[model samples]
Target: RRSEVLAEESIVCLQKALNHLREIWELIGIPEDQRLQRTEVVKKHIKELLDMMIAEEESLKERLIKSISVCQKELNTLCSELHVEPFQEEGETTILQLEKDLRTQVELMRKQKKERKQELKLLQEQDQELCEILCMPHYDIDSASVPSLEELNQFRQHVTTLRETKASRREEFVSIKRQIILCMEELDHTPDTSFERDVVCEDEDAFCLSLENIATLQKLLRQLEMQKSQNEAVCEGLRTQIRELWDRLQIPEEEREAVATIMSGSKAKVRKALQLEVDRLEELKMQNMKKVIEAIRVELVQYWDQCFYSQEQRQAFAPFCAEDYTESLLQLHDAEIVRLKNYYEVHKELFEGVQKWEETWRLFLEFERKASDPNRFTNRGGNLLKEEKQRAKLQKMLPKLEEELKARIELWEQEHSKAFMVNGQKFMEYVAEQWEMHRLEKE
Candidate 1:
């Protein structure tokens, strides 16, 4: 990289010699001082400058060779795939040929470099981002030197591949997201996982589109697809059987739309329209829909209260308030009660926290009331202080237990996608209610 610089100019004795020449020239203003007198000498002076180029040209070739060699090594690195050869050949050598060849080489490299940069810029505007999102690598590229044609072509391929894959991944993800939405709607299923939530979120078309993520969705999609598919098979058979029963041979909510919409868009439509119509027409058979349905409400509300159903949960079994309840309405309420009964049975241990937390709250309140009285100060015994200890302990213990209970209740509430109730109120609202009441009493 290091080349010593040549000295710029000779200025020492050269000045004294110029003084000697000036003295001579001034004294010998010649009879024909053609050099100074004639403006025509300007052309002759130009000849002197032109005449110097011949000698300088020899050294100029030396400098050109040096410059070209430096350029050659640089280009050699950039386009290593096609090495730029520096040969010592005997080809009727001329400085002009050497320069012309070097110039030609540089022009080609410049052209290629410009094109590579142009292609790189265009490709990067899209695929560079695509690469990051798709989790692909960036292709390397140059200006002082340029990448090879072969390299640029491969880079293009690199860009092309990710772009195409991004489009494909994007297509499938969008389709799967929509399919997931329909499935959740049809099944009346709320999102469970964060991943599930994002997939079904209203911000459509927003995604990482990474291959890993896309593949993960494919699994989820297939699961939903199969779930909907199996339901389709089950319901289609049920439909024909129900029709045959009516013909017989004998024998459906809008809720069935809730079930079928997960399946095929076509099948969901067919099932929804058919089942809705059947339910409406057959609803005429109920001896008295509201009276019977309201009577069933007592049964439902019994299970609802005992199981501590949240308001929303109770509201969900809305057949009681529906305009035209039928035999299926009875089935719906019974089914809901059975479901709650199962939930309460399984999670009875969790519900026990409510009882325990209540016990703790009562003890805290009793002790707090007593603690407020001066009667405790009259006693100077271990019992009093210990009573103080127990009272303080209970007061502190009360909130912790309440929080612990609510936290456990929250697990169930959130996991089940509904609220849990304690004392005819949602657990959150109930705890808050008690906190406010106690604070007001203290004040």
Candidate 2:
């Protein structure tokens, strides 16, 4: 019975030890499964991280390629407009440079990826150790599990750093791109071209190719200045010539000075002054000519009046009096002078006959008056006889003279139609009768 009891206790103790060993195995499997699961999770997270980073890199590369292409086009355009040489040939221009920079960034990302991979590799190695610890019964698995979790946490931190680094690089690229766009804008590029260029430094002086343009502009400015000076000299000479012409025109002093001052003033004022001066001179010339014409007209009127013209005859000559210009007045004067001379020449015989008749009549009147006076008769018989003989001779000649005068009157009347008279007594009587009629009507 004692042996059976001892055997049962030994069985119980062995069962307890076996159960504890099973518990230890279960503990080891738990940590081993945890390590493996955690390692797998970390590897999956790393793959996702690497994929994300790679995708980001690819996206950034595409963006960089597009940006570089645009920059190259803008650079080419700038070179053309600025009349400068391009920085590089078409294939190896700014685009290629940017590509190289992108490659550099990619290389940095790749290096970071490699570093993370190495850290993951180290973590995997530690996980392997944890697996080995789980396999071994005497090793401290609890302590081994600590390292696996710590390594996973470290890898996570590395991934975080990598993510942060990627974000920083992306931001840096964006900043560089913005700066490039700004530079292009400063150079007066189009908005499309400005944003198309690759990012570059802010030192725009290095990229400027306007030195030759500056030199050309400076030369043009100098030439323009020289031309301006020559033009100014020419203008001065022209002004002097104009002044001389103004003097030669013999304009009034006040008018000439006003014109000269205006010529040196605004263009509108100069034109106005010139027009006013021309008008004034024309008016003055017309006034002087009018005075001259008036004098000639008066002379013509007086000359016509002296010709013993009747009122009706003078009225017929009113056209000559109405003429106001020199040329017309002079023509009238010449024509009237010719008419008067012709009239005098044609009427010479008639004028002589009338003068002889007037002398004969006056002598007969004087003899008759002496014979009628008593004092004259008492003067002397001899004088009276002489007077009587003279009177008798005069009386004997009076009838023949009267007959001659009647013949002369008939000849004059036939030649002149009895219309022309030295004193116009018949016309005067007609004018007086008409005036009286007009006065009666008025009353």
Candidate 3:
């Protein structure tokens, strides 16, 4: 009973040590290579201790051998005494009868040895079974650990990527800030009065340019209209001359009628000729008007482009030098408010994303805890055993969820050129929805 107690104590200690090692492994969020190295160290020490225990068991087997040897010596002594008095059976128990008793004792000893050998084989097989269980991958038994570790690694990588991206954006912001500062300093050195004076000069220059362009267009339009009218008058005069020539051609009555018809025809033909010339002139005027309109459009586009160029430069520099500005200082201040708001919004989104993932992991951990609880197998909550069988079903769902998250995140990154949580929140909602559905179905 004492030995049994001692064996139990040893087992308890070993189990305690194993539990401690598992806890340490859980806490150590190290790189995969480092984690493996540490696990190996623990595994090696456990193996060594196990080997030592096996060796001690072998030593106990050796003691069994010594006991068998002592039994054999006693049997030999009994046999010798029996042989010395082989024919005295009538006086007392003779050598032959003693020899028979000695043989029976020897047979009993041989049976005990056989039993011990069988017991030793059973012990070896048990030890081998224990070793096999210990050497097997822990994930196969725990199961939850594999996906959890993968998630942890992915989370770490995501954090690193986010940090890098933020750092890059910060650097860009800093550079822009410097440029804005320089612009502000330049503005500060200049007189405010000078800007007002320059504005007036700019307005005058713009007005003069507009007036000159308008006058030139007006003059060109007037000249084209006058030339068109002059062409019409010359065509009309030529038609009248042809009409008079036809009127002078006279002869017999039929000839006279023919002459009158020809004169009328000449008048009609001359009118058409004049009309054609007027139409040609009008077409030329239209072409000129089209050119003027095109020129105006091109100039307007160029002006807007120049204006936008300045605005774009300012936009590019705003992130860096937003604080530094002379004109539109109030506008910059307002913009800062907006930027800070967006920054807060981004942080909120990230926090919600974290909360969502935590909820998912928590739910999974709770399910695992319930599944592993020995009491759950017998209690009212033993329905969790069904869940345990369905645990693999849930695990299978995670890969699909992870894949969807990745796809969505990729899409978000493509659209925004920024790291954004895409499906973490969605997954949480899905889980909640599924849970509700499952609850209703069970009811």
The best candidate by lDDT is 1
lDDT against true structure, model 1: 0.67
lDDT of 3 by residue, 1-443 (tens): 99999989999997998778767767876556776787789789989998999999988777656655665576665445323222223556543445555556777655655564554445445444433422222112222212233543554464455446545544543454344334334324232444333322333222212234335434533554464456456655755554443354332456445433333322335456545644654555455545544444344344323222244433543332322222244344445445545554654544344445456656665676677666875674646647776676666665565565556556645876764322333444564565566557557
Q: How many residue pairs clash per model?
A: 4, 2, 4
Query: TM-score for each prediction?
Result: 0.33, 0.28, 0.17
lDDT of each: 0.67, 0.55, 0.50
Instruction: Flag regions of model 1 displaced more than 4 Å.
Output: 1-128, 136-146, 185-193, 202-205, 223-443
Candidate 3 accuracy as lDDT? 0.50
Residue 61 accuracy (lDDT) in model 2: 82
Model 2 regions more than 4 Å off: 1-307, 320-325, 359-367, 377-402, 412-443
If candidate 3 were superposed on the true structure by all CA atoms, what would the RMSD be?
65.8
lDDT of 3 at 32: 64
TM-score of decoy 3: 0.17
lDDT accuracy of residue 54 in candidate 3 = 96
Residue-by-residue lDDT tens digits, candidate 1, 54-109: 76987887888887787667556545534555444486767667667766766676
Cα error, residue 370 of model 1, in Å, equals 92
lDDT of 2 by residue, 317-350 (tens): 6564444555556566567666765675676664
lDDT of 3 at 334: 47
